[PDB]
Each structure stands twice: as C-alpha cells, then as structure tokens.
Amino acid sequence: VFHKIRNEDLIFNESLGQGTFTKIFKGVRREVGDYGQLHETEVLLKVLDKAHRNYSESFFEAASMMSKLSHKHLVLNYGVCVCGDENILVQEFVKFGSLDTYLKKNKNCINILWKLEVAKQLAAAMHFLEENTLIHGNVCAKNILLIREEDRKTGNPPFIKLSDPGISITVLPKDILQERIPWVPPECIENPKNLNLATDKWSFGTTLWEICSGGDKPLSALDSQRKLQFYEDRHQLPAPKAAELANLINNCMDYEPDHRPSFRAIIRDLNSLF
C-alpha cells in the first residue's frame, strides 16, 4: 500500500519532539516531481522507537487509513523509508505546526471567529471520516496542524489539516490511555474495544475545549488515578471563558456514546453562530 523511499533521498534534521513511542524530525526529501524536475522537499520524518518495535503493525496501519482517502483537511503520507533497521514514516511537513502550540503562543490574538473557522474545518474533516466509517481515534489539538495562518491583509481564514492517529489505543498499555483522559472517552477506558465512530465525537468535544481554552490541557492538574475517578463521578469539563461553544462541548462529550450528535448536526450548530 505504501510507496517506498530510499534513505539516500532523506536527510534528517531538527527534532520536532516525540509522539507515543515515536521520535519526530524535520527532514529533507530529494525527489523527481512533475515534469521530471528535481525537488528538495522538506518532509516530516517520524520514527517508531526502536525500543517499541511491537507496535509497528499499528504504527503503519494508522497512517495507511489516512492514505487510502484524500481530503483537503487530511495530512498527506509520502511513503515509508527503506531502512530495514528502522520504521520511518515520510509525511507532509505542515509549516506552522500543531494547533495547541499556536493557541498557547497566540492566546490573546484569537477572537471567536478564528476558533469557529478552525472548529468548522475540523468538523468537516470528521464528517468526511464519518461518511467513510473511518475511526480516527486520537483527535486532539496536538494532532491539528496549521497549514496557513489567518491573513489580515486579505481577510483570509486559517487552514488546518488533521494528522494521522498514531498507534491505536486498542493496543496501547493502560497507563497511556488514562494519561489521555479526557481525550479517550469513558467507554474506551473501561474497554479499549469500545473504540467506535462515537469515540471521535467525544474527542472532538475535548479538542473544542482546547480551542476555547487557549492551549490549556483539560484536567492537566489531575493524575492518572483521578482522571479515572473524574469519569466515575461522571464529571464534565469546566465551561471555557470563551463560553460560546460550551454547550456543544458538553453535547459532544456525552457519557452515552449513542447520544453524541453526528458531525452533520455539529456543523449545523457551528454554522448557527453569528
């Protein structure tokens, strides 16, 4: 399924951090593009931690899901690097990076319209996946990549893409899932096989919270043990100061998975705001 890329054609540069059992780097690809012309293309290189070769089967499948479909709001995978000793994904390098970084960094510079346009673009991406019964499983602001910033000169909106989900919570050890509360919905902490299209509506709600909360991580002051007890007492996240999306957040984060609204409904809510 995956186009193979030589390592002579890939240079690793800056570290961009770590995923779950992965190391991420900005890189450079030398390729023949359109019209036989030669290109040096900056790419994203994410490496499965050698200490965790276990999950390579999931590691790659997650990217596979994202590449069988094509959508303006989904990050492109270029292929896999031929290493033999390493499992390396070659993907589109989004210029401005993660949304959570951008929110924190630009706390005050974001009005409600900015958040709304981004919420809509994310809902459009999730609706598209919904039509294809494609479970993402790791929706969060960290995995929202900003292609372009808003342009004030032209009054142009920002544009976002959705990265691949990574290793699937169906195989991640317990300690990781609970660290991902409240992005992982309740039913999946009681049983990871409850992973379902309804999961992505809950995580969307959490991501919406991140977007109004200017980069704060919900429940970050609470440790693993409480994050479980937070779900046992069936608590809801606090209303963000930017409170125009609090109702939608709570409707999305419904402890009953069957009651969470479809993303068609969600879009209609988002569209019905000024």
Positions 78 through 137 that interact with ligand SKE (CB under 6 A)? 91-94, 97-98, 101
- Strand runs labelled E in the chain: 4-5, 10-19, 22-32, 38-48, 77-81, 88-92, 144-148, 159-162
Q: Which of residues 198-237 bind ligand SKE (CB under 6 A)?
A: none
Establish if 168 lies at the interface with ligand SKE (CB under 6 A). Answer: no
Assess whether the previous peptide bond of 238 is cis (omega < 30° from 0): no
* β-bridge pairing 144-148 and 4-5: unpaired
Of 87 and 143, CB closest to ligand SKE = 143
Q: For ligand SKE, give the closer residue by CB, 145 or 249.
A: 145
Q: Determine which residue in the list 11, 17, 80, 147 makes contact with ligand SKE, applying CB under 6 A.
A: 17
Q: Does 16 bind ligand SKE (CB under 6 A)?
A: yes
Query: Is position 24 an interface residue for ligand SKE (rule: CB under 6 A)?
Result: yes
List beta partners, residue 139: none
Size of residue set near ligand SKE by CB under 6 A: 16
| Amino acid at residue number 32 | V
Burial readout 95-109 (b: 16 or more C-beta within 10 A, e: otherwise):
eebbbbebbbeeeee
- Closest-by-Cβ residue to ligand SKE is 97
Counting contacts by CB under 6 A, is residue 142 touching ligand SKE?
Answer: yes
Give just the sign of the alpha carbon dihedral 169, 216, 233, 199.
Answer: negative
Closest alpha carbon to 117 in 71, 149, 93: 149
Judged by CB under 6 A, which of 44, 99, 188, 237 binds ligand SKE?
Answer: 44
| Interface positions with ligand SKE (CB under 6 A) | 16-17, 24, 44, 75, 91-94, 97-98, 101, 142-143, 145, 163
